[PDB]
């Protein structure tokens, strides 16, 4: 607990990661002012589990984690405990006992292109579901059958990543959304991230 935690770096970053390669910022030894988050009206999703956001300035934690990525709007519902889908199963999984906040806002003006933004990708094939907070960035050919693929595309041998190709669509559910997930860790250790009141 010393200087202020750099939340604006996470939220106002020029570029966001692909969901399959989601970014994580580890926040330690600072004073965290969450008022800039829960007093803003720009967010379309703001859901906290195990904690109320209006109390965050009065709480202390061992560490805080800020995960950021981009997904489709109709996929934001999958960033929640117990959910399923391509994002939750193969790209970014929250734990059942999650303590934190999920914050998402429409980023069509930033991440959409008339010709499509193909810099943003998601994992489409995987042998098994991701464990909570697991990151998988491999590009190995997915083996759909029992025949080894030998790193070559073909029948039952598919590239595992697929691009969103974000465009300025008509339905908001198809547009890109930027997501920040705040995780509040509590261990048997001194607290290093505290709200200004503490």
């Amino acid at each position: 607990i010393t200087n202020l935690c750099p939340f604006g770096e996470v939220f106002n970053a020029t570029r966001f990661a692909s969901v399959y390669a989601w970014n994580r910022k580890r926040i330690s030894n600072c004073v965290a002012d969450y008022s800039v988050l829960y007093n803003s009206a720009s967010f379309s999703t703001f859901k906290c589990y195990g904690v109320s956001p209006t109390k965050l300035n009065d709480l202390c934690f061992t560490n805080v984690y800020a995960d950021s990525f981009v997904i489709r709007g109709d996929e934001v519902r999958q960033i929640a405990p117990g959910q399923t889908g391509n994002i939750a199963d193969y790209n970014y999984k929250l734990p059942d006992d999650f303590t934190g906040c999920v914050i998402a806002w429409n980023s069509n003006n930033l991440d959409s292109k008339v010709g499509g933004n193909y810099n943003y990708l998601y994992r489409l094939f995987r042998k098994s579901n991701l464990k909570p907070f697991e990151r998988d960035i491999s590009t190995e050919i997915y083996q759909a059958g029992s025949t080894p693929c030998n790193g070559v595309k073909g029948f039952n041998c598919y590239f595992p990543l697929q691009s969103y190709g974000f465009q300025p669509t008509y339905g908001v559910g198809y547009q890109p959304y930027r997501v920040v997930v705040l995780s509040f860790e509590l261990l048997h250790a001194p607290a290093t991230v505290c709200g200004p009141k503490k």
Partner: antibody
Amino acid sequence: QVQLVQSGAEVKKPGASVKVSCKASGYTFTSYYMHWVRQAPGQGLEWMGIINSSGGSTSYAQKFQGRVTMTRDTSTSTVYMELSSLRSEDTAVYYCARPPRNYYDRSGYYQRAEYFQHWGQGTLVTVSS
Amino acid sequence: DIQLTQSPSSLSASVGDRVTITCQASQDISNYLNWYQQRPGKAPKLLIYDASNLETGVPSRFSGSGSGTDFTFTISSLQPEDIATYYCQQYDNPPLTFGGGTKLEIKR
């Protein structure tokens, strides 16, 4: 990979009691509420009550108050619904249903999300002599 | 308790048609209304939650609307495997209650 596996179909005499189990796997058992819903043959769905898998607190529907007891065993990740003084109207398929977690919105208000995303296969309980 | 009246009790329609069933609540229940589809002999499967949100994995042909007392549930392109009984369910106030159901049949 979430699974709710319920105990087998049973026959019970009138005036007796039945205990239906619901074993949970594939998720952190104590993180979710567990609900019980019963369906008489050819009828609609009826909500019985809710149990907190963490602390075991319960809340029952009025028409089952004093007659139903809901328990949980964290060691076996199992939820039990016990119904006593069984009558013919209690002959039904009993279901354990799991909704997602509740959450707080930006304003700090507690929001419930009681829509049942997972179900057990159900347990047919026949009340007959 | 809050009573949910579903209409119609049962109905039939051909493949490809649009179907719209309704659920009316006795009191105000905001938008805390869910729609389940129960195929014969299995447990109900959630399709719509909070009266408009499509559950993950549900085909886009399903939709819902409403807030207050009147709610509607719609299938755009009727499909052979949509044969089931549909129930609405509120959670605005305990005890949780379900609708009477709507048995949907297919013409061929």
